[PDB]
Design a protein around this ligand. Structure first.
Ligand SMILES: [Ca+2]
Ligand SMILES: [Ca+2]
Ligand SMILES: [Ca+2]
Ligand SMILES: [Ca+2]
Lengths: 88, 90
């Protein structure tokens, strides 16, 4: 595996690491996303995940209004955080 | 750095490794993309980057019609292939 492929694999595995804990094993709940942000993106959220921001994040990603983020919906998040990592 | 932050940093450094080769240092030319595909995404392109497929890929990725792939266009490409990777994985 190339370095890029290894990195892409971590994008995949990370989603499932959090999604598979609670509820639907293939969707990220609010709570699973909060954990993902705090543990995986501390540079973006710091030590405390802001409740209102989390609600708006979830709402913007959750295109089918099931209150969860599926992997297709999560790909939008991946694109955003990739751009953010380049710029900031 | 978290495993996810380390992964994102690889996506950023990989882009610039290839984009900075020639021409605009912040955009992937068709040639730069060909190499990136060949060396970095062989599990998606394989051993040869196909020429017709390369032209189709560039066209599909190139939302601003400048015949190159910029960072945002690349970020969308990778998010699409990770949805592909997740399909293969799941
Ligand atoms: Ca879940
Ligand atoms: Ca959803
Ligand atoms: Ca270039
Ligand atoms: Ca372009």
């Amino acid at each position: 595996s190339s370095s890029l492929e290894q990195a892409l694999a971590v994008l995949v595995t990370t989603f499932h690491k959090y999604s598979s804990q609670e509820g639907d094993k293939f969707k990220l709940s609010k709570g699973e996303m909060k954990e993902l942000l705090h543990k995986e993106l501390p540079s973006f959220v710091g030590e405390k995940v802001d409740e209102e921001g989390l609600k708006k994040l979830m709402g913007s990603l959750d295109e089918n209004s099931d209150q969860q983020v599926d992997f297709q919906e999560y790909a939008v998040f991946l694109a955003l955080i990739t751009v953010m990592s380049n710029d900031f």
